[PDB]
Amino acid sequence: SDGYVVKETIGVGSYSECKRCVHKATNMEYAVKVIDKSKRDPSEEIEILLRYGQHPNIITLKDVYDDGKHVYLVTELMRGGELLDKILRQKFFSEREASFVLHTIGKTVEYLHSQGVVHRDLKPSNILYVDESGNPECLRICDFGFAKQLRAENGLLMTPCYKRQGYDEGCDIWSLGILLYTMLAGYTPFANGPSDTPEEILTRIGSGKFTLSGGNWNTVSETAKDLVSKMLHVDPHQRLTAKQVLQHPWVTQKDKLPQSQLSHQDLQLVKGAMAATYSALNSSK
Amino acid sequence: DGYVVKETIGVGSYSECKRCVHKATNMEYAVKVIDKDPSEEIEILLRYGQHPNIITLKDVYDDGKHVYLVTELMRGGELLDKILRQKFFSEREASFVLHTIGKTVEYLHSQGVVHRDLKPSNILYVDESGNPECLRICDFGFAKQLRAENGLLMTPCYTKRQGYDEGCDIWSLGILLYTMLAGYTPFANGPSDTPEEILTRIGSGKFTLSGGNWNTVSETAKDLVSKMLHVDPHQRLTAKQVLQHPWVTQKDKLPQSQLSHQDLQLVKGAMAATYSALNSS
Ligand SMILES: [Cl-]
Ligand code: NA
Ligand code: NA
Ligand code: NA
């Protein structure tokens, strides 16, 4: 407030608005998440970011303010925009580059799960690039407002080390699964565009069925299909763990992966179908 | 100063503990005065200090020269004072002590924390009742949190030095167990034992589990002690395995007769000499 000048708005949720701000002292660009305390308690979000925000692929918390009415999360500015914008447009993209994306993200989720943290909102729009390079190491997971830290009755933090978290972890993997599905197919598994109704989408999701043939799937590697189908398994307690995903041949034997560009559908269609899919899911939640 | 400092309770080669009284609420606390890096100690206490059996951190001050750790006052004094004197004590009560402590260690280990200084004088009672739930683990100045190269906290699960370090925590539990059962320490006879006598005994990996009192101690307790004190550190039990031992899980089968013990000052003296020998090495 006294040390940042607020610029344009980047995005905006029902409890918070993210905007671009500039540090006065050093004149460097950052992002501030402005949260209305009198509507939400970001308490767990702030703790998680302070504790695990040092992980290279988790957005970094750089300053926290609480003038009383609002809470201000200052973080690194994601200049590279969202994942999908990148991989569906500017950037050369084959199974090889996709495996790196999954590996970077899946590795960060595996770390989080091991610490007893579930994200619960791993939609593609929450995965951003810190810069315009499109390099895997530049990926950041960016919105921990639904994230939950596993706790004992008396508040004690706990690790899976020491059925709701197995259900919650499965949700993080399912999200990874549809992102994977999209990167490979160039379309989303349960929606055809932004105008799909919750009815169409939830029926498809409920059936536990999705296409792994036709279109790109006709040239996509058999082991990628194997992996996607185990990440998207209908019974949440039968999906792979993050660890098992990282141990899949599609992730570990990258030199065997095809290196030809992947076909994809219009970017606005794909992001639209993706938003409709998570809107449908929030509905039944 | 929101506290008024009273008498001194104890000392340490890097600290001095005294009883103080909170001014605002007029309640009694304990302050540890440290001569300035309690950094890793403070982090651990803030993070895990909510565990019922870990001392609770209530306030932290740093005027520059000294650091002030305000914690709960341990009115029950040290473990051994209690169980060797002013408390009825059989294998049943011993199993409760191990269970309370071993449970708190198992939690710590799972979080990537090793204590490294689990001597009986670091285990206190919050009050004079001698109840198990009143046990507190109290000094984390050697404790170490498992971390990645980039500072990331890590648990043993995600992730040979920690298996070695955990084995040291279990070994300490083992000699405490040994003492509660035998009424004397396994590697020293009194406060006058030399580091050479003690380390030779420890090094041999041998100790008495027969004759004398041992003839009336339960077989399963002997079995457990011998696996906690195993000479090869990577062959001792994990904390988890200790809590899964029949001596800990089938308490209704334990004997309930008072345990023989030696003079209290002799035992605490031999215990101090034992850890003094170990710090030396
Ligand atoms: Cl694509
Ligand atoms: Na980071
Ligand atoms: Na979809
Ligand atoms: Na506590």
PDB file of N, CA, C and O in Angstrom, chain B residues 8-47:
ATOM      1  N   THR B   8      15.728 -19.229  39.877  1.00  0.00           N
ATOM      2  CA  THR B   8      16.303 -20.040  38.811  1.00  0.00           C
ATOM      3  C   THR B   8      15.992 -21.518  39.059  1.00  0.00           C
ATOM      4  O   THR B   8      16.096 -22.003  40.185  1.00  0.00           O
ATOM      5  N   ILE B   9      15.602 -22.224  38.003  1.00  0.00           N
ATOM      6  CA  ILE B   9      15.205 -23.622  38.115  1.00  0.00           C
ATOM      7  C   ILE B   9      16.352 -24.570  37.789  1.00  0.00           C
ATOM      8  O   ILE B   9      16.553 -25.576  38.471  1.00  0.00           O
ATOM      9  N   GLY B  10      17.090 -24.248  36.731  1.00  0.00           N
ATOM     10  CA  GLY B  10      18.214 -25.059  36.305  1.00  0.00           C
ATOM     11  C   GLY B  10      19.124 -24.318  35.349  1.00  0.00           C
ATOM     12  O   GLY B  10      18.892 -23.146  35.037  1.00  0.00           O
ATOM     13  N   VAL B  11      20.142 -25.026  34.863  1.00  0.00           N
ATOM     14  CA  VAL B  11      21.151 -24.451  33.982  1.00  0.00           C
ATOM     15  C   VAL B  11      21.459 -25.365  32.796  1.00  0.00           C
ATOM     16  O   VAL B  11      20.942 -26.479  32.699  1.00  0.00           O
ATOM     17  N   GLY B  12      22.315 -24.878  31.904  1.00  0.00           N
ATOM     18  CA  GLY B  12      22.771 -25.624  30.746  1.00  0.00           C
ATOM     19  C   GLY B  12      23.985 -24.915  30.175  1.00  0.00           C
ATOM     20  O   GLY B  12      24.158 -23.717  30.393  1.00  0.00           O
ATOM     21  N   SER B  13      24.828 -25.643  29.450  1.00  0.00           N
ATOM     22  CA  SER B  13      26.068 -25.068  28.932  1.00  0.00           C
ATOM     23  C   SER B  13      25.812 -24.028  27.844  1.00  0.00           C
ATOM     24  O   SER B  13      26.748 -23.509  27.235  1.00  0.00           O
ATOM     25  N   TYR B  14      24.541 -23.726  27.604  1.00  0.00           N
ATOM     26  CA  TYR B  14      24.169 -22.733  26.606  1.00  0.00           C
ATOM     27  C   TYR B  14      22.872 -22.042  26.994  1.00  0.00           C
ATOM     28  O   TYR B  14      22.247 -21.374  26.171  1.00  0.00           O
ATOM     29  N   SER B  15      22.473 -22.202  28.251  1.00  0.00           N
ATOM     30  CA  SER B  15      21.186 -21.692  28.704  1.00  0.00           C
ATOM     31  C   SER B  15      21.054 -21.718  30.219  1.00  0.00           C
ATOM     32  O   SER B  15      21.798 -22.413  30.907  1.00  0.00           O
ATOM     33  N   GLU B  16      20.096 -20.950  30.730  1.00  0.00           N
ATOM     34  CA  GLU B  16      19.698 -21.038  32.129  1.00  0.00           C
ATOM     35  C   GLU B  16      18.191 -20.848  32.249  1.00  0.00           C
ATOM     36  O   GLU B  16      17.628 -19.873  31.748  1.00  0.00           O
ATOM     37  N   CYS B  17      17.542 -21.796  32.911  1.00  0.00           N
ATOM     38  CA  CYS B  17      16.091 -21.819  32.999  1.00  0.00           C
ATOM     39  C   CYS B  17      15.612 -21.274  34.338  1.00  0.00           C
ATOM     40  O   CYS B  17      16.059 -21.721  35.389  1.00  0.00           O
ATOM     41  N   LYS B  18      14.708 -20.304  34.299  1.00  0.00           N
ATOM     42  CA  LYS B  18      14.114 -19.796  35.531  1.00  0.00           C
ATOM     43  C   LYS B  18      12.598 -19.658  35.485  1.00  0.00           C
ATOM     44  O   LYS B  18      11.995 -19.567  34.415  1.00  0.00           O
ATOM     45  N   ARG B  19      11.995 -19.656  36.670  1.00  0.00           N
ATOM     46  CA  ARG B  19      10.563 -19.474  36.817  1.00  0.00           C
ATOM     47  C   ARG B  19      10.231 -17.989  36.780  1.00  0.00           C
ATOM     48  O   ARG B  19      10.832 -17.196  37.500  1.00  0.00           O
ATOM     49  N   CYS B  20       9.274 -17.621  35.931  1.00  0.00           N
ATOM     50  CA  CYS B  20       8.844 -16.236  35.803  1.00  0.00           C
ATOM     51  C   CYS B  20       7.329 -16.166  35.906  1.00  0.00           C
ATOM     52  O   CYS B  20       6.648 -17.178  35.759  1.00  0.00           O
ATOM     53  N   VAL B  21       6.801 -14.973  36.159  1.00  0.00           N
ATOM     54  CA  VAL B  21       5.355 -14.791  36.271  1.00  0.00           C
ATOM     55  C   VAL B  21       4.840 -13.751  35.279  1.00  0.00           C
ATOM     56  O   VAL B  21       5.312 -12.616  35.255  1.00  0.00           O
ATOM     57  N   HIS B  22       3.874 -14.152  34.461  1.00  0.00           N
ATOM     58  CA  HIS B  22       3.240 -13.246  33.514  1.00  0.00           C
ATOM     59  C   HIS B  22       2.548 -12.126  34.281  1.00  0.00           C
ATOM     60  O   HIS B  22       1.727 -12.386  35.155  1.00  0.00           O
ATOM     61  N   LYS B  23       2.888 -10.881  33.962  1.00  0.00           N
ATOM     62  CA  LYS B  23       2.332  -9.734  34.676  1.00  0.00           C
ATOM     63  C   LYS B  23       0.841  -9.557  34.402  1.00  0.00           C
ATOM     64  O   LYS B  23       0.028  -9.549  35.325  1.00  0.00           O
ATOM     65  N   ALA B  24       0.493  -9.418  33.128  1.00  0.00           N
ATOM     66  CA  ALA B  24      -0.889  -9.187  32.725  1.00  0.00           C
ATOM     67  C   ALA B  24      -1.868 -10.173  33.366  1.00  0.00           C
ATOM     68  O   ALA B  24      -2.846  -9.765  33.991  1.00  0.00           O
ATOM     69  N   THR B  25      -1.597 -11.466  33.214  1.00  0.00           N
ATOM     70  CA  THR B  25      -2.517 -12.501  33.687  1.00  0.00           C
ATOM     71  C   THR B  25      -2.080 -13.146  35.001  1.00  0.00           C
ATOM     72  O   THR B  25      -2.777 -14.009  35.536  1.00  0.00           O
ATOM     73  N   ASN B  26      -0.929 -12.727  35.515  1.00  0.00           N
ATOM     74  CA  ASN B  26      -0.392 -13.265  36.763  1.00  0.00           C
ATOM     75  C   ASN B  26      -0.388 -14.791  36.811  1.00  0.00           C
ATOM     76  O   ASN B  26      -0.853 -15.390  37.780  1.00  0.00           O
ATOM     77  N   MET B  27       0.140 -15.411  35.761  1.00  0.00           N
ATOM     78  CA  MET B  27       0.258 -16.865  35.701  1.00  0.00           C
ATOM     79  C   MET B  27       1.729 -17.279  35.593  1.00  0.00           C
ATOM     80  O   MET B  27       2.532 -16.579  34.975  1.00  0.00           O
ATOM     81  N   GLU B  28       2.074 -18.415  36.193  1.00  0.00           N
ATOM     82  CA  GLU B  28       3.467 -18.859  36.271  1.00  0.00           C
ATOM     83  C   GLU B  28       3.947 -19.558  35.007  1.00  0.00           C
ATOM     84  O   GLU B  28       3.304 -20.485  34.520  1.00  0.00           O
ATOM     85  N   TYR B  29       5.093 -19.126  34.491  1.00  0.00           N
ATOM     86  CA  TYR B  29       5.703 -19.773  33.335  1.00  0.00           C
ATOM     87  C   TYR B  29       7.183 -20.071  33.571  1.00  0.00           C
ATOM     88  O   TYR B  29       7.736 -19.757  34.623  1.00  0.00           O
ATOM     89  N   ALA B  30       7.817 -20.691  32.583  1.00  0.00           N
ATOM     90  CA  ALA B  30       9.242 -20.962  32.647  1.00  0.00           C
ATOM     91  C   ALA B  30       9.935 -20.268  31.485  1.00  0.00           C
ATOM     92  O   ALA B  30       9.475 -20.338  30.349  1.00  0.00           O
ATOM     93  N   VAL B  31      11.036 -19.588  31.773  1.00  0.00           N
ATOM     94  CA  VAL B  31      11.795 -18.928  30.720  1.00  0.00           C
ATOM     95  C   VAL B  31      13.194 -19.520  30.600  1.00  0.00           C
ATOM     96  O   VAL B  31      13.921 -19.642  31.588  1.00  0.00           O
ATOM     97  N   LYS B  32      13.555 -19.905  29.383  1.00  0.00           N
ATOM     98  CA  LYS B  32      14.896 -20.389  29.103  1.00  0.00           C
ATOM     99  C   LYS B  32      15.710 -19.247  28.516  1.00  0.00           C
ATOM    100  O   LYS B  32      15.381 -18.719  27.457  1.00  0.00           O
ATOM    101  N   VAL B  33      16.779 -18.873  29.206  1.00  0.00           N
ATOM    102  CA  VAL B  33      17.657 -17.790  28.771  1.00  0.00           C
ATOM    103  C   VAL B  33      18.868 -18.335  28.012  1.00  0.00           C
ATOM    104  O   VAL B  33      19.733 -18.994  28.592  1.00  0.00           O
ATOM    105  N   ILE B  34      18.932 -18.055  26.714  1.00  0.00           N
ATOM    106  CA  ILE B  34      19.986 -18.606  25.872  1.00  0.00           C
ATOM    107  C   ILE B  34      20.978 -17.535  25.420  1.00  0.00           C
ATOM    108  O   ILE B  34      20.584 -16.476  24.930  1.00  0.00           O
ATOM    109  N   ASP B  35      22.266 -17.817  25.593  1.00  0.00           N
ATOM    110  CA  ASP B  35      23.315 -16.906  25.152  1.00  0.00           C
ATOM    111  C   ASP B  35      23.507 -17.013  23.644  1.00  0.00           C
ATOM    112  O   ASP B  35      24.106 -17.971  23.153  1.00  0.00           O
ATOM    113  N   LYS B  36      22.990 -16.030  22.914  1.00  0.00           N
ATOM    114  CA  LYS B  36      23.096 -16.023  21.460  1.00  0.00           C
ATOM    115  C   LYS B  36      24.546 -16.221  21.026  1.00  0.00           C
ATOM    116  O   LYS B  36      24.836 -17.022  20.137  1.00  0.00           O
ATOM    117  N   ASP B  37      22.508 -19.829  18.326  1.00  0.00           N
ATOM    118  CA  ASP B  37      21.563 -20.085  17.247  1.00  0.00           C
ATOM    119  C   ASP B  37      20.484 -21.085  17.659  1.00  0.00           C
ATOM    120  O   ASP B  37      20.531 -22.252  17.266  1.00  0.00           O
ATOM    121  N   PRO B  38      19.508 -20.627  18.458  1.00  0.00           N
ATOM    122  CA  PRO B  38      18.335 -21.431  18.804  1.00  0.00           C
ATOM    123  C   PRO B  38      17.349 -21.450  17.631  1.00  0.00           C
ATOM    124  O   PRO B  38      16.176 -21.778  17.823  1.00  0.00           O
ATOM    125  N   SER B  39      17.831 -21.126  16.428  1.00  0.00           N
ATOM    126  CA  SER B  39      16.976 -20.997  15.253  1.00  0.00           C
ATOM    127  C   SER B  39      16.178 -22.262  14.964  1.00  0.00           C
ATOM    128  O   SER B  39      14.952 -22.212  14.852  1.00  0.00           O
ATOM    129  N   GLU B  40      16.874 -23.389  14.852  1.00  0.00           N
ATOM    130  CA  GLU B  40      16.229 -24.648  14.497  1.00  0.00           C
ATOM    131  C   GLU B  40      15.418 -25.201  15.663  1.00  0.00           C
ATOM    132  O   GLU B  40      14.481 -25.975  15.469  1.00  0.00           O
ATOM    133  N   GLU B  41      15.784 -24.798  16.874  1.00  0.00           N
ATOM    134  CA  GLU B  41      15.041 -25.190  18.062  1.00  0.00           C
ATOM    135  C   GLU B  41      13.710 -24.449  18.090  1.00  0.00           C
ATOM    136  O   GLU B  41      12.664 -25.034  18.371  1.00  0.00           O
ATOM    137  N   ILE B  42      13.757 -23.158  17.782  1.00  0.00           N
ATOM    138  CA  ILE B  42      12.564 -22.322  17.802  1.00  0.00           C
ATOM    139  C   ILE B  42      11.553 -22.725  16.729  1.00  0.00           C
ATOM    140  O   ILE B  42      10.350 -22.778  16.984  1.00  0.00           O
ATOM    141  N   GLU B  43      12.047 -23.019  15.533  1.00  0.00           N
ATOM    142  CA  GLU B  43      11.188 -23.458  14.439  1.00  0.00           C
ATOM    143  C   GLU B  43      10.482 -24.762  14.791  1.00  0.00           C
ATOM    144  O   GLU B  43       9.277 -24.903  14.589  1.00  0.00           O
ATOM    145  N   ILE B  44      11.240 -25.718  15.311  1.00  0.00           N
ATOM    146  CA  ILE B  44      10.687 -27.011  15.692  1.00  0.00           C
ATOM    147  C   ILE B  44       9.607 -26.879  16.776  1.00  0.00           C
ATOM    148  O   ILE B  44       8.574 -27.551  16.723  1.00  0.00           O
ATOM    149  N   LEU B  45       9.841 -26.004  17.748  1.00  0.00           N
ATOM    150  CA  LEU B  45       8.901 -25.835  18.847  1.00  0.00           C
ATOM    151  C   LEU B  45       7.635 -25.135  18.393  1.00  0.00           C
ATOM    152  O   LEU B  45       6.544 -25.425  18.883  1.00  0.00           O
ATOM    153  N   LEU B  46       7.781 -24.205  17.458  1.00  0.00           N
ATOM    154  CA  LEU B  46       6.628 -23.503  16.918  1.00  0.00           C
ATOM    155  C   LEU B  46       5.781 -24.447  16.083  1.00  0.00           C
ATOM    156  O   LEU B  46       4.557 -24.376  16.092  1.00  0.00           O
ATOM    157  N   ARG B  47       6.449 -25.343  15.373  1.00  0.00           N
ATOM    158  CA  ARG B  47       5.780 -26.218  14.427  1.00  0.00           C
ATOM    159  C   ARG B  47       5.138 -27.438  15.091  1.00  0.00           C
ATOM    160  O   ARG B  47       4.003 -27.798  14.773  1.00  0.00           O
TER     161      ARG B  47
END
